[model samples]
Target chain A: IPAFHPGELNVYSAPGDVADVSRALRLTGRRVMLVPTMGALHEGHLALVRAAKRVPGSVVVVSIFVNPMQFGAGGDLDAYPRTPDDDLAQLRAEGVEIAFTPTTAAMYPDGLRTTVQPGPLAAELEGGPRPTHFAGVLTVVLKLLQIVRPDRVFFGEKDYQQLVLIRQLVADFNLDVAVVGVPTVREADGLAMSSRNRYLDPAQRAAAVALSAALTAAAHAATAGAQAALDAARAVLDAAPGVAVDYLELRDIGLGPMPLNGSGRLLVAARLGTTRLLDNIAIEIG
Target chain B: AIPAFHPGELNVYSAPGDVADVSRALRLTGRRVMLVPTMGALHEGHLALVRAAKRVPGSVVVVSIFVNPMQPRTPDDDLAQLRAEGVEIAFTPTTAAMYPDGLRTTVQPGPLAAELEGGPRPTHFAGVLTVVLKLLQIVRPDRVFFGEKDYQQLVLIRQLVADFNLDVAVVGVPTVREADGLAMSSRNRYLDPAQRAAAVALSAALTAAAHAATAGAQAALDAARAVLDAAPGVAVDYLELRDIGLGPMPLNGSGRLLVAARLGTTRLLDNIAIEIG
Candidate 1:
């Protein structure tokens, strides 16, 4: 049912169960947009909401679910942040039309067996560390898209690989929906905002800024050359105390291996204490 | 989009672009709907499924005639016969409309798809399941109908629906056959007059096997082979007794006897419900 609040935000607790309510809000015959998120909402996610609203006459929907299937074995699934109250409060404050916070059981009542198997592209970068991650992400995203049936869905560019893979998923399946990627929102110190940032202690958090700094250095050194950009990025990470680099590379926008000298993106992931952080930047390689 | 073709009472949709409009129009009527997806060479077997769809309460039957890229195709003239039967709507999607971006993501039908019919054509069921799932998504029907003529395919589809938790019912109709007991299939057209007469041996063998199944599994196999061996034109491919899941059957109780055989230049398949007590 459509439970409209004074703030004009309608909350749906079941997975896409509020589709009828959405239709009643005149969304059936009109345009609607969606912003899917895991529960620990950040400014990056809110930026997606603003991006969604920019579409004219679009009724914006925000879905929050901490999908367990995406978490690798012993990979902090239990430790993943959940702040539903704050998430809802923030969504309301931002003037989002609907917030869908489906329970885990509601999303996968029996169990999730059928999943979207993203091809070899998903097996690299983020998928390298978490093998089953993209399958889980894509499956749940597809389920949500089917249920919501929105005109456009917004995703933050923070998860660049995810955005690209989702685009492929829509294309392959012939799903009649548009995917729009919003720019990543970052802290003043340039650390990309992430839910896992909560896992970092003060010391780790301070060191985590190296990821964004390295990306910035690579972007600045782009005109110099590919090797120069890599060296510049590596130098920043090498000096950052308590930072352990996982992978630091320059690749094409689609995350393919970089050409010798052309436009590409710099991506990096590193661990600060036990917390892992990732960031990327677009650069023009000489 | 071209206006829907009307032949008799049926509305023919040859373009994928018009499917959504047809779906919306049908849905707006507030009638419960069922879909029967076919490659569209109408026969008594396919027509039986359409009849079953109409049996559902407040049902609106929609049939799609797309010759899926993954499946064996029939002639476009098959649409003439299908239209004559008075279908409500028939979707005929082209290859470009079906996989516009080149299908990168595939639906792997899991381990069950690796056995039985899958063993011969390795990628067969994968293609079947993927296309069926795509059709299900496109149709968004309350229920979908299939024929037991393709028993393994039916079971695999049932598994796909259960595994995916797709919100649609899967209904299977009994296999429809000709008077001489040969299974009705578009492939039957491949057989010459003599081979057509010999094809009856396949179903006859299944009948003999089903009767002897009461004695034991081995007796059933022996009985089935005796029939195939006796037929001059029949060349057996695989004839065996198995469970409904297509796995090897145990000592007793109800199961199925499936057969695939070559008659001259044509291949034909048939199966029978069996009980070993």
Candidate 2:
């Protein structure tokens, strides 16, 4: 168990302690909004806090959990970055009321057998590659929801699949909290904001823009047909040297198969050197 | 969506809106609340839980009686019996209301759930934990009461509450049994007169084991099994000694002796605390 370290910010290492803070916050009769993240906060994450603050009568809370279960054996669990000082500073700047930073042992004590499985929506897309990922995400999210009892929670569209799955999770479980999906925050060069972007070398970083570029192309050609949209995205990735395409498809907004004619989304995942980058864009399919 | 229906003064709620109405009502009164979840059929066992809830300071006891479709057990009972006691609220949600969009999400209890009763009914604990979690989420109670008759289930519920960081306390009440020492269960109704008489052997066996525990685990287990073996028209499912935490026990000292047996088509489980000095 992580000891409660008192600081300038209301940062808690235990869920019960955070709930104490949350209960006090709720007593004020203001709607509480939760922004959950794995520490190492960036502009994209702060943008989520900004969105949370925008909600009327909102008291924004930011939860920072590294979540071991979401990381697969092949994935970057050990290598995942953590800058708690920087994270707290950024959250303090955003006027976040509570920063929940619970340790692994604190989250899963001895004999923790209950796990939330978010159904087939988890078995698709990112879940196809990292099977246990969404289960971990949903489990932690549910815990946070229960502890904070927030009126609403903010999720970044940067993790589009994750945002969708969380929406499903909330609906499936009949949780009262509102699921808000903030648009993807991006860089000047159109690279989607991601924590994993730190892993790329300058050249790899420059080449990673191909994913966003492909999505843009697919979005532009989406009016023609689903095939045309897919081809447009594929053409951009094929031309980018050292950009290995993993999956590039134009599917429905829900990540299901594309409808005959309607709105859809273009999603892509590809490897730039050893670092993998994923990006998605909304499109109108005819 | 199932239409909201009020069954007696309990304010029976099937729709989420009505459930929220009940919550808002309690919140306005500034009442501390405790929840007692049951599969209906008002029995002494359930009344004991209601009694336990009433004992808590300033608690407004809410007993939710929903026969979860997944587990498939419907209980017929009197609303007046609950009202006569201190039960302020009785929630009876419809199957459609409880599982409106179908049972998609589930709370899976891993290895611990795969043992004992879970071994026979594979999806039982998962169903149980999921419904309990849903109830906890819906009611948002200060504390939830459970009976020790389902000792393994009580332990699992405690683990779930801890794991999920649910802001609700879990209270376990001792099992309420018949004069013959047969553990109180809704399934007891399934037993024929002859089987019901033989089913007394289940608790009788546990008592024998508890008495012989001072002699050591081997002797205690033998005494318990010998009782079951001699009992007519009873089929033994499992008879073992385990720690209070549901782990395999050491040879001597204090632990729990649990047994499950079938009397015709009806299955009954019973357990007793054992101490070796």
Give residue A276's error in model 2 in angstroms: 0.9
TM-score of every prediction relative to native? 0.80, 0.92
Per-residue lDDT tens digits for candidate 2, residues B121-205, read: 9888888888888887777788899998888888889878878877788998988989999899889988888888888888888
Give the per-residue lDDT digits (tens) of candidate 1, residues B65-140: 7666665556456566655655667787888778775666767666767766776778788778778887777767
Chain A of candidate 1 gets a TM-score of 0.93
Candidate achieving the largest DockQ: 2
lDDT of 2 by residue, A1-286 (tens): 2332323357788777878777776787878889999988889998999999888877778999999878888548888998989999998877776788888888877634688987776888788877888998999899889888899999988788889888878876768889999888899999988888998898888888888888888888877788888888888898888999878766678874336358777778888877888888898876
Query: Which residue pairs show backbone clashes in model 2?
Result: none
| Residue B4 alpha-carbon offset, candidate 2, angstroms | 11
How many pairs of residues collide in model 1?
0
RMSD of candidate 1 to the true fold? 4.6
Among residues 3 or more apart in sequence or in different chains, the pairs in candidate 1 whose N, CA or C atoms overlap within 3 Å are: none
Error of 1 at A84 (Å): 4.0
